[PDB]
Amino acid sequence: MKTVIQDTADVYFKRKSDGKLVFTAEAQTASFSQAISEEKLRGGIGNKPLYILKSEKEINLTVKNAFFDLEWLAMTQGSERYEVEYRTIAYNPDTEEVYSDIYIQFPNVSPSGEFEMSLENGNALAPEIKFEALADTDTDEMAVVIEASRD
Amino acid sequence: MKTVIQDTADVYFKRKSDGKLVFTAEAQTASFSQAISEEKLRGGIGNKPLYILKSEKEINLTVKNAFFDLEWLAMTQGSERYEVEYRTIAYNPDTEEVYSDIYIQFPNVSPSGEFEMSLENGNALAPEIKFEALADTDTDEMAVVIEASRD
Amino acid sequence: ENKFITKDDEVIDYIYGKISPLFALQYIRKIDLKHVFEYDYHFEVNGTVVRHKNKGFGYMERFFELKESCDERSKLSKKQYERFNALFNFFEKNGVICMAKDAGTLNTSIEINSLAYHGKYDVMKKFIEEQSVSIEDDYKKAFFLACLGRWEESYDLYSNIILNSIDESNGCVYYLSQINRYRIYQSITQAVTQFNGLGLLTFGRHYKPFTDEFLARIEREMTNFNIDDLFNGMPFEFQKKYKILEFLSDNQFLYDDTVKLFELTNKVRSEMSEGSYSFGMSSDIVVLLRLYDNLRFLYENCLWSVSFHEFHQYIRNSMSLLIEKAEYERTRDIDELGFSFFGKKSGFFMEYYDFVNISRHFKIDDIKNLERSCSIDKIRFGEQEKIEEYLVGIAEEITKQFSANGMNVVFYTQFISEAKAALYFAKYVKLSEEGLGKIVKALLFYFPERDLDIGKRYVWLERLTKCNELPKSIISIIDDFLVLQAEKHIDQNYSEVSSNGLYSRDYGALIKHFEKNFISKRLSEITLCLTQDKQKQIDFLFKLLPLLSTNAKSHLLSFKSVENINDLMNGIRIGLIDEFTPEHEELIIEYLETRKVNYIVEKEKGIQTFSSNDYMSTFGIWYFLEEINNSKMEEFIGMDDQYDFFVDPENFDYKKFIPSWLKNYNDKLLGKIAGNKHMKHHVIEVLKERVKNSNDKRYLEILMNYFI
Amino acid sequence: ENKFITKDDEVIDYIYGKISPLFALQYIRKIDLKHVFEYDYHFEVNGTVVRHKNKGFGYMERFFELKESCDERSKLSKKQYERFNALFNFFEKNGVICMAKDAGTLNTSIEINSLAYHGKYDVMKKFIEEQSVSIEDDYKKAFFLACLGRWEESYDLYSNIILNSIDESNGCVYYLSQINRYRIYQSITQAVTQFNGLGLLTFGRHYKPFTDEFLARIEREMTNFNIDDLFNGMPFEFQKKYKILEFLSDNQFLYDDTVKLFELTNKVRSEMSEGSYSFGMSSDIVVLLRLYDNLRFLYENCLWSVSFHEFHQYIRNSMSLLIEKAEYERTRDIDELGFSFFGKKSGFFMEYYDFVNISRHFKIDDIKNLERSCSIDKIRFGEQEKIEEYLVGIAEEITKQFSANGMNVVFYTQFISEAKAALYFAKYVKLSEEGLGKIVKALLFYFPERDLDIGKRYVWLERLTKCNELPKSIISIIDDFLVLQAEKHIDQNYSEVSSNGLYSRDYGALIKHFEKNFISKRLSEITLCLTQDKQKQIDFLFKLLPLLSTNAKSHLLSFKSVENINDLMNGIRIGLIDEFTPEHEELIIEYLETRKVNYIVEKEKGIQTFSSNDYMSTFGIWYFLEEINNSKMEEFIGMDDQYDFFVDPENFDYKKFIPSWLKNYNDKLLGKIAGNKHMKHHVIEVLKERVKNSNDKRYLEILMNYFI
């Protein structure tokens, strides 16, 4: 009651082309990073055009609790690029009441981890796992977000 | 033989009112750290100020030794200032030959030792002792340099 | 051994079997609970637990289930019901709450109950005088004897308890009795050398706090003491119960706790350079919790490592990262959801305990590094009433020690490092009237002159008025220090040594800067009685010409004289000289010819020097501000780097420019050069380079406000 | 004992007895010698020695005097003369030069000779294929197998040595092999667990490198073994001579040295905020000398502890500090003394020995961390000839593994990180024309798609074109690459991927960004036979338009993707459209209308969007600069902030402004914005605020060069 405060999150990871759900739920570190940039890649053009708005852009995500699954892990035991739903709750600061929940949806996912902890002293499981937001050429990609609190 | 190269110097304290010498063969850490700033002062009245030169300024020093002087440390064991002189040499980069001696002097010193350097393991002496550029209101003081390399 | 755990009643017995021996401690650290359970579980710093190496019944899961089942708690006999209550109240004090799978929102408490922590020196002096009752009370006093500095009878008491410990058959005290004998011995050995080597130069004398015979005893007792084997000599029964307490023997107890700050600071330092977002507990709260998991162990149980420099290292870097993380979290950008993630912040509210944390274990230099990076003024201060009681407490203690003839140096060894940083961080708080009264009376008079020269006392006393006013009561206190200074200015060899060069005049100037029409009364009285024969007091008096009666000033008219460069500057320091007569200019040129005669002589001698308070810097400043239009001054071009930049913008070399001048210059002076056409462009470039390449924020501020 | 030394030659007989048993070991950390001599002398990393606990004869001080004195060496007997030469051969190999009192200008040699460090993977297969002629060669062979990723064949040979190492008087091999064997098993524990959980989906399949029977056996032998007691179980004789390895049994040793880097790291950063200098051995060179020592001792003794994450942490943070120290050394302010003491800056030169370090131990996210805080372009990279051999060592090693059918997947986790990171770090080294033709070929064709999406590959090939131009050989590899990705792009579901959204569109841009007249004979052959009904093939090479022949262009302008809005912007991105017609503008209005209706549905559902293909920001920019004269744009004010920042600047709410957008903006847009009245008086304020608050330099480039 003195000084601390914590909150909660949740991570859902899913596989395209099937109702399978092969992953965890509860991001301990839950680190998410998004950034934009540019360079001199277009350092020279024929002029009289307009733009391309490259911006590079990138989406880096992470989760760490493990316990992926047993049924679907066994089913895969014997390359849709996967998709993500992120659910978070938001409360009104004036009243501190639970009224809004957040949906986060990245249609394309990419599993790419540094496949060697090799830690000199054994850990308590928790294999942190990082995430790169994949994307095709067609349309949208990245995310669409939904919001609760329709009170 | 491949890459590193190091150097050394000489440290020389002195208590005024008499030829009191105390010295270290080396100044290893030698954390010499000037500073110059200004934050706020003056009332901003009288139309023409006609001046404004307060330079505050602050100085420090450091030295390493285990050689406090054999004789009068114990003589007093059983406040006339502590002026110190830093002397070293400089070489021409083109020839790399020792051709110049660098002298450093301070007119009136005051050791400001935080008398709580107790630690949790037996250290190899290394009594880091700190001085400060102390000055009266007469004139000059602070710092002065002497240079060889007449050739 | 744990493969026969199946019964509900036996589960309570099992947790009773292993956790009960630790009740003799006021508290045991949270994460270390894995040692007691043979790595069966993993105890997170938040307190909740995740299965680690359990191959059978989760006996910890059942106890948490029993927590929420009021009916099942009634299914235990009065004994086993009492067995749970002892375990339960043990689980609320220790910060463990519930199962991780069921962990919702956890609001852990923080409380350091040690009286030594709270700067309550005076009540503690009465506690020792009370009669001892129990064996543990003796150990508690064996600590309090040390915190005050009485390292002599602390050791003698420690030798007393170890003889008395075994008779009651108490194990925890005996182990922690011996450690505080070796560490305090270490506190004894390094002080005696410290007194002899530098202490002789420090205090001007070879003061002795320790009797010669006593030193001979302690060395004999602890000469062949190797602290590694100590936990290996205690019997098997002890070695089975308190296997958690083993780390405190060797020095690994601060090595296991500083690495997990260094790997953690790497992530926090990494995360501030990516624009990343983290959910739930950020990387920073782990540091804050671990600091407060640590502050309890070494103070509730009365360990003596609170003064060693290795622990001063640990609080130094834990808060430093957190204050960093409070700076960066105050300023960065988002697209849309960045605030939608954790749409609030603690703001690093710095609470009353956080002020004890930095006031104690920092040095005057270390705070200054933090001040440059993290803008502490922008961080909010909490509990502005408890924080007074520590400041008034410290000021109260200063008056007791030094107004009375008694100062016991071992007390002065620790007490002064904390006392300094206590009153440096007193600026940022909105103080009360009585605190601003007592503290200022404390800092001016009894606080030692050595550790705080007459110069820097300006830097602290003036520093407190930034966020605090200057009431009449505080005006009375400050004017009194002048009266004492007036009874002091009859010495024959005093010079008012300082590393700042602002003297007893400037404190009075601080009064007038707030209360301009505050004509001094007593300083006038000292002036009138004085005569010309004894005139050392002139130098202070004319320097404090700002405050005087009209006749007292008229006394200074016929009295006093002006014939040199300090009379000019000190007279100009108050603005009395509104213009320079041709006679005054002749005095100026007379100075210059001597320096030029000096300049050629040393150059012929191949010698280069830097004058400290060289007014030649100012002599150039006068010409540039239309102060003096004398054409003869051009004969002294080329000797001083600062001087040449002013006189001849046409024929001056910009390679020798130093970027530090454009810091040290007045609002009006920078404008005139900013208005000059010759050097604006060349001033701009060397200024432009340094803001781009470097991180001195003051260069950034100067360039936009004036030159743009 | 030592006080009872007596005569001159009794010293060498004593030194021999302590340092010779270490001759079985190869290279001994200069600081680790304090253990073997009972802490008698303290060992400085700079190569000097100073008495700590000695009170008898100086058995070390006479030894160095004999080293200097020549006539004294002849006075010894032939054996003692040999014994001195035996000891003299050791110290010069260790770098312990002389005593501190006679310390001169020391230049210690740093020479790491392990073949693994040089990464000559070819030779390790050559040496191993041989019959052993010593127990030593067997163990030196047992470490080469673990470096190659062979974690199974190593175990059997690791088990061979333990049985053969008992029937002789040498505990060196027995103690070192068992450390490795347990370290191969602990690696066997993680990879097997790491493969099972995330390895099924990481590689696209489940790969079981380790056989079931081997997995059962390891879980049988090691299940009742605790490493902490390994040193205690050895004979009393081994506990006496080899006290220089007891820290190595446990992982306290990297903790005790990783914690030590914290104090220096604190000192180095502490030395930065004050602008301090350093005479003698600076605090930063202490890290430089300490860093190689922990390196060679493990690389030259083949201690398997070298390839662990905890090890990577200590060398990741060490070099970040020096590169920072160099970065600060370059930007020092210079006030009045630096030139005389340090003129003609002797910068920290990035030798070959500094390149294997960064290439091996940093991950790809970590090097990007160094970029935003270290201008690593300025640092000189010397010894550029030897950089080529290890680089071609990489670009040749990658070709072997992924061309052949067999991939040693255990090796794939420890190494693909290395090969990944190295070719990133080639953009600060001048590569020869021939050597580059091997780098570019490995990077494009056979480097797997998994760890480098086709979008990310350009970013890698584009960095090698900074420090080196485009020789006509290089285009020959990009030439076949496009003709490889296009022809594979004939299956109807063989889509591409990206992590930049690049695809093959911008590969041609790099070509024409250096070339002008590439006609790409193969591309003409492809299109010359493309009949019809290949939509995916059509759209793919349509945006390669700058690199087709004249007849291919006209023939493909026929039956081309019509004007569809994706094709419209891409057709512009190839230069097909130079001006917007009303037909072109008419299509835009659909998208503005199409986006609006979905927005109304979105608002009812409370759904927002952040799409990769957001052209909304683009449409407003075209409208600001008069490209689209259609006046219906104002109807679409209020959906996206970047839209209504440009379309209606006069009525724009600049509070909403997000200052990140300015980074994507180009100078041509940053100039016109600087001219517009309705967008000048607020953008200036936000820019000043962020530069004062954060170190984003790109803001300062924007603020100074354009907005001022």
From TrEMBL, chains A, B:
Organism, scientific name: Bacillus subtilis
Name of this chain's protein: Uncharacterized protein
